[PDB]
Structure 1
Amino acid sequence: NPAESDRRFRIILSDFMALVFFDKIILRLAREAPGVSFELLPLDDDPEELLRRGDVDFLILPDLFMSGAHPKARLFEERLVCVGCPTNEQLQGQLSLEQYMSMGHVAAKFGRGLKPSVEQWLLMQHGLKRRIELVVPGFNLIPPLLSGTNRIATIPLRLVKHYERTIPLRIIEHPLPLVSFTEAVQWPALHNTDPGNIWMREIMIQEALRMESE
């Protein structure tokens, strides 16, 4: 049976991916197969161990982190942007890093063991002293809380397109380049032979391709 089993699958992803990726995927299988269930989950600190053993069936995440001890398929690429509130005023006209420094910034959890202290010593040792005034858990909350303030942030670009209708966002000429990145999904080794996980992976890669047509 290709896609009509009662097999629950366990996925580990970020809120950005769920709201830009799996939403389509759930709609495909919604009409096509009402037999499969899922259980989205959040990112721990040792996701691999969960993969060393089994439990979860996938880990969608930026690749720079994924290790080489397990399968790894490629999905799509995304870039980052420095956004800010339209109502802000000092942001009309490209500005120096000086302003970037002074202006306050928002940021995301990116994990669990934040230990906010260490990051500064680093960036400051490279020549940047940013003042983080608001830390939140994830990306999806950056757009709603920023609007109405004199603060700026760095988020993936696909996000600002999602909120164009509801939250007017202002793409900003950053004083420095905007390295981008690729997204991947990895299946626990010792299970590349399962019947169906392959079908799932296919579903995913497929949508990714579809999604790259823009």
Structure 2
Amino acid sequence: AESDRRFRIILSDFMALVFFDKIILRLAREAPGVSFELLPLDDDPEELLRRGDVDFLILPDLFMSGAHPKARLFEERLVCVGCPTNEQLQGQLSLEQYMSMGHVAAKFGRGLKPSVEQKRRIELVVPGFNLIPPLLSGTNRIATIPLRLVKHYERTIPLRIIEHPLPLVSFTEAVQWPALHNTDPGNIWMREIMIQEALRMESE
């Protein structure tokens, strides 16, 4: 906790904003010499996990392979959202109506792996999750995104949750580390801190 180690983490802009922010906050107190490079999700993360060029990979666990140690962070529900200004979004929407509307969707980098949800007519593609609410605001487009993201934006961008009529989908966000680092003291320390925070979040 008195180190000057630089950790490298691969994660979504969503996970950076809604979760890792807690880590940076806490450690700015508990370990003020520890630094971070947050890397964008784009290429197979495995290549970097096998070589040990990254300390951590945060991803929903369905997208990880079984060749590195991983740990459950928390459950994330996927909801369908729209702009309060949208008329059709007033009332209940039929799965048929969903597939009849214009969609905003996130494509991470070169789109190696697919969005947990994805056919819909996508009229807006963006490099992450976080730009989706602002670029959706004021149009008749809908999107499907983490429920923790909609809450982060509650006081900033009002969003109408319309998923109530469609399938209930939830994934479990998780953290993975290289097996070559399973006994690194820095790695176990950061690991345990991340899991602590994720449990706090599971309570919410």
Per the normalisation by structure 2, the TM-score is 0.93
Moved more, 75-84 or 176-185: 176-185
Kindly provide the CA deviation profile for residues 112-145 of structure 1, in whole angstroms up to 9, marking residues without a partner as x: 14699999xxxxxxxxx42110100110000001
Cα RMSD (Å) of the superposition?
2.3
Residue deviations 1:153-190 (CA, integer Å, cap 9, x gap):
10110011011111111011454312101011111012
Structure 2's unaligned 5+ residue stretches are none
CA distance in 1, matches of 2:38, 2:114: 27
Deviations 1:92-117 (A, max 9, x none): 11122332122111100134146999
Residues 94 and 173 of structure 1 are in contact (CA less than 8 Å); yes or no, is this contact kept in structure 2?
Answer: no
The separation in 2 between residues aligned to 1:111 and 1:181, in whole angstroms, is 21
Distance 1:73 1:113 in 2: 24
Equivalents in 2 of 1:103, 1:17: separation in Å? 28
- Larger deviation, residues 104-113 vs 141-150: 104-113
Q: Aligned-pair distance for 1:196?
A: 2.0
**Could you report, residue by residue, the CA deviation over 1:38-70 in whole angstroms, capped at 9, with x for unpaired residues?**
100011322101111021111011110111111
TM-score by length of 1: 0.89
1:117–1:173 CA distance, 2 compared to 1 (3 A)? closer
Structure 2 distance, partners of 1:163, 1:108, is: 17
Alpha carbons of structure 1 residues 94 and 163: separation in structure 2 relative to 1, 3 Å = same
17-26 vs 170-179, greater mean Cα deviation: 170-179
The verdict on how the C-alpha distance between 1:53 and 1:106 changes in structure 2, with shifts beyond 3 A counting, is same
Distance 1:16 1:116, change over 3 A: closer
1:193-214 Cα deviation digits (max 9, x unpaired)? 1122111101100001111122
Please say if 1:52 is aligned against 2:50.
Answer: yes
Q: Identify if the C-alpha distance between structure 1 residues 56 and 76 changes in structure 2 by more than 3 Å, giving closer, same or farther.
A: same
**Distance in 2 (alpha carbons) for counterparts of 1:118 and 1:14:** 13
Residue 147 to residue 177, structure 1, CA distance change in 2 (3 Å): same
Larger Rg: 1
1:8 to 2, 6, 10: 6
- CA–CA distance in structure 2, aligned partners of residues 179 and 117 of structure 1: 13
Deviation at 1:18, TM superposition (A): 0.5
Q: 1:204 to 1:116 in 2, by over 3 A?
A: closer
Aligned counterparts of 2:87 and 2:115: Cα–Cα separation in 1 = 31
Structure 1 portions without partners, runs of 5+: 120-128
Q: Aligned in 2, Cα 1:173/1:183: closer, same or farther, shift over 3 Å?
A: closer
**2:69·2:178 contact (CA, 8 Å) conserved in 1?**
yes
Distance change in 2, residues 1:117/1:48 (3 Å): closer
**CA distance in structure 1 between the aligned counterparts of 2:104 and 2:150, rounded to whole angstroms:** 15
Q: Which moved more, 1:90-99 or 1:157-166?
A: 90-99
Structure 1 equivalent of residue 110 of structure 2: 112
Q: Identity of counterpart residues, as a percentage?
A: 100
| 1:203 aligned partner | 193
